[PDB]
Amino acid sequence: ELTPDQQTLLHFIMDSYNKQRMPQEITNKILKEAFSAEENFLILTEMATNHVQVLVEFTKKLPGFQTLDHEDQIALLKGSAVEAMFLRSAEIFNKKLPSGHSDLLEARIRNSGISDEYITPMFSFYKSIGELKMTQEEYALLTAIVILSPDRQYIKDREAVEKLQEPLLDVLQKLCKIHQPENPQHFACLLGRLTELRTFNHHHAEMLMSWRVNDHKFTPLLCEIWDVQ
Amino acid sequence: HQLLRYLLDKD
Numbered sequence: 722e723l724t725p726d727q728q729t730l731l732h733f734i735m736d737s738y739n740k741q742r743m744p745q746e747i748t749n750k751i752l753k754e755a756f757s758a759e760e761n762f763l764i765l766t767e768m769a770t771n772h773v774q775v776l777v778e779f780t781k782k783l784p785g786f787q788t789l790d791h792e793d794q795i796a797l798l799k800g801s802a803v804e805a806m807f808l809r810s811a812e813i814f815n816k817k818l819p820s821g822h823s824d825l826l827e828a829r830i831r832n833s834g835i836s837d838e839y840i841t842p843m844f845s846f847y848k849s850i851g852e853l854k855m856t857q858e859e860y861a862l863l864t865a866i867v868i869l870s871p872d873r874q875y876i877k878d879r880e881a882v883e884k885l886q887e888p889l890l891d892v893l894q895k896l897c898k899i900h901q902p903e904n905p906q907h908f909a910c911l912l913g914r915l916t917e918l919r920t921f922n923h924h925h926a927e928m929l930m931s932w933r934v935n936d937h938k939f940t941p942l943l944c945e946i947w948d949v950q
Numbered sequence: 951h952q953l954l955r956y957l958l959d960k961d
């Protein structure tokens with residue numbers, strides 16, 4: 722069972738996580754009408770610019786984050802930004818919608834402009850997340866755990882990050898035993914999903930440059946976070 | 951990364 726300190730930590734992580742754009746806001750736009758690859762690339766860059774901004778504010782509220790080395794603070798943000806974006810997309814994808822809606826959303830994403838090469842692994846990851854039947858708290862804690870990964874490249878003080886990640890891992894493990902007591906492998910399955918997240922980060926720049934558009938225009942903020950322009 | 955630095959250092 723969670724302690725008073727863990728219950729406090731969980732609600733605080735939840736409130737900060739809830740400051741994001743609503744899944745319905747995103748799915749309403751995609752489902753409403755079909756767009757060209759040019760319009761979809763523009764929708765994606767704006768969605769991703771908003772995501773980075775909201776992620777920086779979420780990251781700042783993570784306990785102990787502001788006490789870390791400033792250069793390590795940047796390495797953590799640069800290292801998790803794309804993974805956090807794909808995890809959020811996976812959450813929105815697996816949110817329950819009326820009959821036939823999730824079939825149309827999938828078809829709309831498949832024909833967004835992205836090359837077929839990246840479509841299959843992206844939907845494989847999304848569908849694997851859905852099979853886990855994750856609660857909102859599980860997605861929030863997993864995002865926090867992704868940001869506070871000490872095994873990130875360029876990190877100077879790995880132990881300082883470890884100290885921050887460990888209490889979040891403990892809370893998630895307790896929720897996994899409470900939410901799914903019939904599946905004792907649930908916690909391990911979520912941690913396993915983080916390795917698949919890292920593959921999308923390796924092919925992120927190619928996914929964007931292979932989009933079916935004549936010009937790949939990026940915002941100055943996206944140029945800092947993504948390895949583009 | 952001056953934009954990220956700005957977003958982290960701002961109150």
Ligand SMILES: COc1ccc(-c2nc3cc(F)c(F)cc3n2[C@H](C(=O)N[C@H]2CC[C@H](O)CC2)C2CCCCC2)c(OC)n1
Nearest residue numbers: 747748761764765768772806807809810813814830833928
């Ligand atoms: C880089 O390649 C790609 C290719 C697909 C996506 C992608 N997967 C989605 C799965 C959903 F269930 C969904 F609703 C949208 C999704 N998108 C885009 C988007 O807008 N993602 C933002 C990310 C940040 C959040 O705050 C909000 C969602 C995409 C959908 C198709 C039209 C254009 C926008 C992507 O996002 C990670 N990256």
